[PDB]
Write an enzyme that holds these catalytic residues in place. Structure first.
Site, mmCIF file in Angstrom:
data_model
loop_
_atom_site.group_PDB
_atom_site.id
_atom_site.type_symbol
_atom_site.label_atom_id
_atom_site.label_comp_id
_atom_site.label_asym_id
_atom_site.label_seq_id
_atom_site.Cartn_x
_atom_site.Cartn_y
_atom_site.Cartn_z
ATOM 1 C CG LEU A 24 -46.718 -25.274 11.132
ATOM 2 C CD1 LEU A 24 -47.922 -24.835 12.106
ATOM 3 C CD2 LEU A 24 -47.062 -24.648 9.902
ATOM 4 N N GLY A 25 -42.776 -22.946 10.549
ATOM 5 C CA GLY A 25 -41.897 -21.860 11.173
ATOM 6 C C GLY A 25 -40.465 -22.045 10.885
ATOM 7 C CG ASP A 26 -36.986 -23.930 8.374
ATOM 8 O OD1 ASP A 26 -35.875 -23.945 8.999
ATOM 9 O OD2 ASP A 26 -36.939 -24.664 7.378
ATOM 10 C CB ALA A 28 -38.960 -18.942 13.001
ATOM 11 C CG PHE A 29 -43.201 -20.064 15.397
ATOM 12 C CD1 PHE A 29 -43.602 -21.126 15.184
ATOM 13 C CD2 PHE A 29 -43.323 -19.018 14.468
ATOM 14 C CE1 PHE A 29 -44.287 -21.691 14.180
ATOM 15 C CE2 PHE A 29 -43.945 -19.140 13.210
ATOM 16 C CZ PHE A 29 -44.373 -20.723 13.122
ATOM 17 N N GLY A 30 -40.054 -22.362 17.952
ATOM 18 C CA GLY A 30 -40.128 -23.719 18.562
ATOM 19 C C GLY A 30 -40.232 -25.023 17.514
ATOM 20 C CE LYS A 31 -39.236 -32.200 17.578
ATOM 21 N NZ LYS A 31 -38.936 -33.185 18.655
ATOM 22 C CE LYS A 47 -45.663 -23.787 21.312
ATOM 23 N NZ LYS A 47 -44.267 -22.939 21.355
ATOM 24 C CG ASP A 139 -45.435 -16.975 30.235
ATOM 25 O OD1 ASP A 139 -44.306 -16.580 30.266
ATOM 26 O OD2 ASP A 139 -45.758 -17.818 31.057
HETATM 27 C C1 LIG Z 1 -50.716 -24.795 24.017
HETATM 28 O O1 LIG Z 1 -49.991 -25.553 22.778
HETATM 29 C C2 LIG Z 1 -49.530 -25.056 21.943
HETATM 30 C C3 LIG Z 1 -49.634 -25.712 20.807
HETATM 31 C C4 LIG Z 1 -49.196 -25.306 19.343
HETATM 32 C C5 LIG Z 1 -48.822 -23.947 19.414
HETATM 33 C C6 LIG Z 1 -48.474 -23.264 18.087
HETATM 34 C C7 LIG Z 1 -48.167 -21.910 17.990
HETATM 35 C C8 LIG Z 1 -47.732 -21.208 16.935
HETATM 36 N N1 LIG Z 1 -46.540 -20.585 16.949
HETATM 37 C C9 LIG Z 1 -46.542 -20.201 15.722
HETATM 38 N N2 LIG Z 1 -47.795 -20.400 14.912
HETATM 39 C C10 LIG Z 1 -48.429 -21.367 15.791
HETATM 40 C C11 LIG Z 1 -49.615 -21.842 15.208
HETATM 41 C C12 LIG Z 1 -50.721 -22.327 16.126
HETATM 42 C C13 LIG Z 1 -51.607 -22.603 15.753
HETATM 43 N N3 LIG Z 1 -52.183 -22.807 14.326
HETATM 44 C C14 LIG Z 1 -51.047 -22.489 13.185
HETATM 45 C C15 LIG Z 1 -49.761 -21.850 13.954
HETATM 46 C C16 LIG Z 1 -48.199 -21.244 19.321
HETATM 47 C C17 LIG Z 1 -48.670 -21.682 20.395
HETATM 48 C C18 LIG Z 1 -48.947 -23.241 20.446
HETATM 49 C C19 LIG Z 1 -49.373 -23.702 21.757
#
Ligand SMILES: COc1ccc2cc(-c3nc[nH]c3-c3ccncc3)ccc2c1
Length: 277
Positions: A24-26, A28-31, A47, A139
């Site tokens: 997800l996000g390529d 842009a917001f982490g692994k 995550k 945070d």
């Molecule tokens: C607490 O563990 C997590 C696990 C996945 C996460 C994903 C995201 C996220 N960032 C961008 N999109 C997502 C995301 C989260 C849930 N469903 C679709 C995209 C943010 C915080 C997260 C935190």
């Protein structure tokens, strides 16, 4: 003598239970991956964090146990957590609308006031629950606010800003048990400006200067105040108050006219437009 025996995080291979649909996000917001439970077919976002020490790992595992203990409709549910091959995998309920900051970057525009009102109300409900249960978030930012398919908000944790301590309260900058309930309220105010303007105050500065700027400046205000209601500006003033005795609590903010709102229609509209773009 009651005692917590173990963490909820398991030392198992997440692939024994979960299939990875895609990233997800390529980056842009982490692994982060979209995942699906092999037996139940439940969808999740996963995550993956590469922990650098036993102490860092333990700190994360404590935080995961807090998240797992939360039960509120505006806090994301923890579905699983694993530690496997030097990586922490954290799985939460899938939120089809994604993170608020990612939506803004996709659409190349900030939220409208009516959208911010809904996000503010629901995020404040989540934050108030945390505070009432003696938990601080520490945070709060748009990257930890997620949208469901039906236009509700879920507060998460460990999010990365979609593409520096912009959200830190001045008393926390100056006094480094530093974080407390009031510091979260300040961070909420900064998150509201982030949603109104895409990026938080002082984003244009050299990042080395940001703490100094927060310490020495008046609290930030909206850049184009004529575009926003007196209620929004006043709500912000109650959060972004340097005098810690005067900064409002979440219980006080819940009574503010800015968060008197009955419908999530503005967010349904927002995510329908993102989904069709
Ligand atoms: C607490 O563990 C997590 C696990 C996945 C996460 C994903 C995201 C996220 N960032 C961008 N999109 C997502 C995301 C989260 C849930 N469903 C679709 C995209 C943010 C915080 C997260 C935190």
């Amino acid at each position: 003598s009651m005692k917590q025996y173990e963490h909820v995080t398991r030392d198992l291979n997440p692939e024994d239970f979960w299939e990875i649909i895609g990233e997800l996000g390529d980056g842009a917001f982490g692994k982060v991956y979209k995942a699906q439970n092999k037996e139940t077919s439940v969808l999740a976002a996963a995550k993956v964090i590469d922990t650098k020490s036993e102490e860092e790992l333990e700190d994360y595992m404590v935080e995961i146990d807090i998240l797992a203990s939360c039960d509120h409709p505006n806090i994301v549910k923890l579905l699983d957590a694993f530690y496997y091959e030097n990586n922490l995998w954290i799985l939460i309920e899938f939120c089809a609308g994604g993170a608020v900051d990612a939506v803004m970057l996709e659409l190349e525009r900030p939220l409208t006031e009516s959208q911010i009102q809904v996000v503010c109300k629901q995020t404040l409900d989540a934050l108030n629950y945390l505070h009432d249960n003696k938990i601080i978030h520490r945070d709060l930012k748009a990257g930890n606010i997620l949208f469901t398919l039906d236009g509700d908000i879920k507060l998460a944790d460990f999010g990365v800003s979609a593409k520096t301590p912009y959200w830190m309260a001045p008393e926390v900058v100056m006094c480094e048990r530093p974080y407390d309930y009031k510091a979260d309220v300040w961070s909420l105010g900064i998150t509201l400006i982030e949603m109104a303007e895409i990026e938080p105050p002082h984003h244009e500065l050299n990042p080395m200067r940001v703490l100094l700027k927060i310490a020495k400046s008046e609290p930030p205000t909206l850049a184009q105040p004529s575009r926003w209601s007196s209620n929004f500006k006043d709500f912000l003033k109650k959060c972004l108050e340097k005098n810690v005795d005067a900064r409002w609590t979440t219980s006080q903010l819940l009574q503010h006219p800015f968060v008197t709102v009955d419908s999530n229609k503005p967010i349904r509209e927002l995510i329908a437009e993102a989904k069709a773009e």
